């Protein structure tokens, strides 16, 4: 339960905590913005720099996570919240062709994301607002599968969905909308389910069924062109894919992977590859590799049989996951060649397509990139949240006490929370609300927990994606729908009762306009990367900074004489743009002699930078201690930093499986230290009782 680190005078006293039962949600769906990018040479590499490849991961709890593959440094960027009685069962990206403007500038095709969730509704997601963009339903059964019709027209794209009562339905996503368009087919039997879908060409849809059949349908007419029969009369074809040559690969409930000739629609081959249901398939872009995953937890790899034309041989199988393999998808481009699989064990697993089965796979964290753990250091509270409940514990100065379970009502999960250092002011957000609470350690209920008082806060009803209370408890800053920065004054009133809190109406804080060419803004993910990932106050609560995924840092200063106002930091525009997304944004608590601040940043590329924001520039320390001088273990981009803990002028940085300590009063060339003994880390948070440091280190192992 306890550990103690000592590095050349610095003591860290650790409470090793495993009692925060952060739940794992199964991965049900995996999908890339692009399956494949065109091959280009080093001379033409710069023609793909502005293409934005993202991975979407859909969870059983309805969460949708946007990941950036970052040439192997996988980084979880944004989590769009699910909600009570919501689940994601399928994901589809629709990415337009690139388009050349009259002046020869390339607009990279825009990417739109849709999902289905065991209902009659298809949902399109607003990546720019991290919330639902539109819902569309029709009179048909629950949708069990869907896909986008491939291009042969390009300005009038179509989705085809199969339902549980055996209907193909067509949805139009024309001119940026989403609506039910037409029912194509009604199977004779309402017990026949359409469970998997793939396109063989623009007009021919392949559908796996629950009645031991695979059917080919013409998209224009709805006519059944070909029926393929398997085997029982209840063989479920959970997965169908088409090879580049038009051949069909199927995976079914009996554990078989079958190959069907694309022209005759006859069974060319049967491979008894799994011992339980085959749930998912993946095919490489060149059609030379097939991947399958099953309820038997195994992943299998197939390659073309030497000599024999159009037939396949199983190369190997291996258990990568701890539970079933529910979904997988491949990406090939910019030197990357991977398949990503997922299942009930909640970890995404990345296999390198060019070196399968050689122990080069990677298991990505099952814990969110955001720590999702907080402390109130002066109160010795530790806090976490998931779904729609906040849990609060007290580490006694029977060293544990469960203080409160705060319920946040809403159709969606909590997106963010913040607590004051003394544990009396608590804030939490959803996409529809920003909620504020007043905590009194003397206010108890019969169930033993704290009595939590609501603090009135009026708002736009657009909620927030991140929320942050200032250290002096006078301000609450949040990011509304990712891109808009808001701030409210927290008014404390004293009386015989003690303190009572009220909150002002939100005030808008304006970020700098950035110079981004119109061909970049109009393509790919639009303004998705302006999503604010960090909000940071300085220790004196007189400066405020935010940074977004694109790497822009905005700064405000508090002007004294409610005679106070937040104003634009005069030298804000001089702060450079980061070349990679910030994972940490933190004001050093140590005052500077020149009255400026040390604003520290860590990026996904493991850059470590300190800016002096009032002067508007990189600090002298950063000018000496550049990237090549950082310790080689720290520069490993497979080790993503999640958080920071200050110890005076020493800074501690942790990832999911790593802990570093740098003495920032010193220059690099040893005076830096690290350890890998802690894993898997949710977060490390200080508590109060060379200054020694006392922290709660929260680990959340699954297996």
Numbering used by the authors: -10 to 141, 148 to 226, 233 to 398, 415 to 578, 610 to 717, 824 to 843, 855 to 868
Question: What's the publication's text?
Answer:
Utp4 is positioned in the center of the UTP-A complex and scaffolds large parts of the 5'-ETS.
The crystal structure of Utp4 was solved at a resolution of 2.15 Å by the single wavelength anomalous dispersion (SAD) method using seleno-methionine labelled protein. Utp4 comprises two 7-bladed β-propellers (numbered 1 to 14) with four strands (A, B, C and D) per blade. The overall architecture reveals the two propellers to be arranged in an orthogonal manner with the side of the N-terminal β-propeller 1 packing with β-strand 1D against the top of the C-terminal β-propeller 2. The first loop between β-strands 2A and 2B of β-propeller 1 forms an extended β-hairpin that packs against an α-helix presented by the opposing loop that emanates from β-strands 10D and 11A of β-propeller 2. A long Chaetomium thermophilum specific C-terminal insertion between β-strands 13C and 13D (residues 717–825) is not resolved in the crystal structure. For Utp4 we observe an uncommon Velcro-closure for the most C-terminal blade 14 of β-propeller 2. While the N-terminal β-propeller 1 forms a continuous domain (residues 38–381), blade 14 is completed by parallel β-augmentation of the very N-terminus of Utp4 (β-strand 14C) and the N-terminal TEV cleavage site (anti-parallel β-strand 14D) introduced during cloning.
